[PDB]
Amino acid sequence: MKRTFQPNNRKRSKVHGFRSRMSSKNGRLVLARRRRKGRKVLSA
Amino acid sequence: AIKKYKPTSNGRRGMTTSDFAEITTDKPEKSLLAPLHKKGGRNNQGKLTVRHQGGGHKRQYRVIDFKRDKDGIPGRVATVEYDPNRSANIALINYADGEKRYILAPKGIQVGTEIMSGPEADIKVGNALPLINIPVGTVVHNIELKPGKGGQLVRSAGTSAQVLGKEGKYVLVRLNSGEVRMILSACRASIGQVGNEQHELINIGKAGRSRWKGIRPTVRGSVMNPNDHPHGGGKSPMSPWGKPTLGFKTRKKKNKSDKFIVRRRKN
RNA sequence: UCUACCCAUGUCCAGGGUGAAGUUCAGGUAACACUGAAUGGAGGCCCGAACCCACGCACGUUGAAAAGUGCGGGGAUGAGGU
RNA sequence: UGAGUAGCGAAAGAGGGGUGAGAAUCCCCUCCACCGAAUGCCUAAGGUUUCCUGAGGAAGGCUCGUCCGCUCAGGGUUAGUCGGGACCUAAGCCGAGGCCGAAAGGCGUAGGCGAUGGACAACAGGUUGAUAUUCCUGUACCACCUCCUCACCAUUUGAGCAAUGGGGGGACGCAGGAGGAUAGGGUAAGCGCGGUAUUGGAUAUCCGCGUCCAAGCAGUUAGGCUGGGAAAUAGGCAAAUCCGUUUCCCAUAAGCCUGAGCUGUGAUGGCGAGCGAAAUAUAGUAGCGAAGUUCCUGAUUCCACACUGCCAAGAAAAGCCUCUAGCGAGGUGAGAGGUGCCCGUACCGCAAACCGACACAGGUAGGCGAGGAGAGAAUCCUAAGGUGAUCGAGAGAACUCUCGUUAAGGAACUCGGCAAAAUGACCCCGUAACUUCGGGAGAAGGGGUGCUCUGUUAGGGUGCAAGCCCGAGAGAGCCGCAGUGAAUAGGCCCAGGCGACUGUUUAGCAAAAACACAGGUCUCUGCGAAGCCGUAAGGCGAAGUAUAGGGGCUGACGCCUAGGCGCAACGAUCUGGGCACUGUCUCAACGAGAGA
RNA sequence: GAUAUUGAAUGUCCUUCUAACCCGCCGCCCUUAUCGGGCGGGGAGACAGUGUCAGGUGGGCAGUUUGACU
RNA sequence: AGGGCCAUCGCUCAACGGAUAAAAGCUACCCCGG
């Protein structure tokens, strides 16, 4: 009855954010990839 | 003593409980408390390491002295309270000087009686002094292994050890549960047996009463799926991880405390 | 961000019934035990809404719905729900 | 192609006017119907312009459309006091030095960050097409400043200020029953209306109304303190006149800190039934305005986690108050005048604006939540308020589904009384074999309940009174086929077997007889414990210490010993038997609604 | 068990002190700090831990396999 | 040193033309094809 998606902004920015991609070594790789492809929206 | 509930239900049939006879107050000492939060048996990596723990009633840590460095000051007893963390029940002592403190309560203590802690203190019922002054053949508790640390052994409810040999700087003691040992010289020791000794006469009565204490259920190894246990599906005893625990001593083959153990319990 | 367990801090549970320990006067005995009154208000207690389950039957199965609706059923101050 | 076929997604509308090229579907009116512990109002997460006005008729609305949560142009969101930041901290996260590791990296001290919690100054009315504790009109409160005016202290033998430090305080569980109030809800004064055309009423008749803030002065139920006073002080790193500790005098009243509320003032104010204009860019708006009291009932809210009981013993830090260290030459206390930043603010929040692909019979924290009968937030009908649910017309065939009634028999049907019928509400009488003495037990089985009169009964609550409110139990009488006259509410009884019990688990697959449980029993562990996670540092075990911890096997209690006995209690348990009952059946027949 | 970390005297590997080395013991400063280390004290000590090197225990942990006829 | 050439020794490779220095069972929870 209850679905697998219930929205929230805090829990989004705190996990898929930019300051949490950039605070690692692999997250920086994700950013470099998505800049290589050419994407418009790098991080959530 | 203990009181036995009347069976006006199914889940309150065998249940008995302490009667809290000796408690003299229902409030703690506000200036001697510290916070304490549950852990659930979870490591510093969040990974569950010990099973069968977690969840209960909220508690708080009550300051209790275990070194008794305040020697040469006669102090008296004021109250005897309840302590959720220990098994015995602690006592609040006010010194004649002004500083308050907590101590373990021996068997039979009475509010008013002063307590000494110096080397020249005379053996009584609630005093603490170095072992190289205690007579031979006396009951004692709250013992310590390195002089200057604080009691660690025999700090349970009802327990008591026995001091019977005094060699060169190595007065040897008999801990609870046999295992006669030879602890160091200058360490301190409390004279007397600890209190609230009926603590081994309690029916927890019902399944939910353990959960108030913080003990989660246990899943038996005989009912398991094949790929966790050598009992699952459907010789030598084993363990969730592998241990032949039916007569294998787990104490180290070689250790550092070997020169100080004279005879062992060995059942 | 669904679901399992745990940690911190909040919040919710219409009404009704039974009547334990104890206490005060009685018999009551050596006081007791033990039998009577009044007072008291325990409980993984009882009947039952909100809430939580999804046990039964029927209807739906190119469904209103990729698991629901109607009529019953269990718990409902707790090892409770959120 | 199937095919102009299946579907058209719970539900009450009808008629009269209007605009329009065009109307079952849009607007206005009048009756009628549905929700009313919500289908009412207010405010979170989330959404992001959906909000208001003027145009529109390509596409989207399961039909239509002149309408729209759709398209095109404009417009709209105002804060010293509300929520968040220039305040504080929990779990957790980051982490200078530092410790580990082939490297990448892992852990962690000081120190920070982090509300779901603690601190903290504003209320009542009015108004626009669209905002209101923000704008406007009344009255307020808080912090900080001094070109200013008063008053009183001060001269280093010192008036004042005062910690980043020490104390006090903030400061905390669950249940139960009193008390005292008030929000709310109903009679008697009073006020404006009214006179009824269907037989009757100037009547003990009918309709509607009615009050009021924060703040500032006064006093107050209650409450706690377990009494305050003096002196001396090996402790609170230093200090102390504060706190703590001890011994002396009176204390049972002085004092202490708290408080729900109530009476004046705010208020020569503003709301208020209801009257009523212009015409206006064709309003029930501008405008005017009566009375505005006592009585009865009363919380699920407040005093207040206050009191009592119990054990499973119930967060931290800051604002605040004091203490000296320390600063010092000018200060304290009133008035008068000033200063007060950033972010959110419309609108939907039980819904066609959020999550489910859809305008989807689903899901969505909290705060209020009225009346009659009632124990009640149950049940039926209604108030304030909201709604007409987005395809229709007519015909009343077989058949499918959801409902109602039935002759005579009643389980004869079937693997199996699956399903449906009967009982159920209060009050009295009465209540067995067994029993782990509590239970079994609402056991089983019996009887009464409507209206009127004596009756404002006996009696009870409130008040001086008058007057309101709750009410047994008895007599006499009246009616019906029938009096818990409708809706909502246990079917019972024997005999055995299993599991002690409450609980958890196969929800996009089945439940018990499976898992767990209180208790028993074995075994390891002397504390840097054993055992666990990690390469290791670091941790859980535990701020624990053999009456304590980790690992196995079994499962209450009582007898009889690692065998066996006892069902009492409890099951959406299992297997047989009996009463009441019924369209399950002999054997089917009419009627209603949806589809066809 | 072997080896290297690894000190000194009687005894033949017997007694023996400690300055190597180890302390999840006490005090003081860096420092406002339960981390870390610097100095003092106590306890133990040629042990213990450690690198290499020579065996056993090792479903603890892996990789795999087990013909044709009918 | 070792190697070659010439006589010659080592096997139930017994599945005997010999895939090797050496190899067991369960899986209508199971997974993929003719």
* DSSP secondary structure of B170-239: EEEEE-SSS-EE---SS-EEEES-BS-GGGG-----SHHHHHHHT------TTS--TTT-TT--------
Tokens of residue B88, six digits: 């015995």
Nearest to B158 by CA among B117, B106, B120, B103: B106
Method: cryo-EM
Footprint of strand C on the protein (CB under 7 A): A 1-8, 11-12; B 3, 6, 8-12, 37-40, 42, 54-56, 58, 206-209, 211, 216-217
**Cα separation, B21 vs B211, whole angstroms:** 25
Q: Tell me the structure's resolution in angstroms, rounded to a single decimal.
A: 3.2
Protein footprint on strand D: which nucleotides are under 7 Å from a CB? 45-47, 90-91, 93, 104-105, 107-108, 167-169, 171, 233-236, 244-246, 310-316, 354-356, 362-363, 436-438, 500-502, 514-519, 522-533, 538-541, 543-548, 550-557, 569-570
**Cα separation, A11 vs A6, whole angstroms:** 11
**DSSP three-state, residue B94:** strand
* Amino acid A14 CA to nucleotide D80 C1' distance, rounded Å: 35
Q: Please count the structural domains in chain A.
A: 1
Q: Contact at 8 Å (CB) between B215 and B41?
A: no
From the alpha carbon of A23, which nucleotide's C1' atom is closest?
D94
Tokens of residue A5, six digits: 């998606």
Protein footprint on strand C: which nucleotides are under 7 Å from a CB? 1-3, 5-9, 20-21, 42-45, 67-68, 78-79
Range of the domain at A31: 1-44
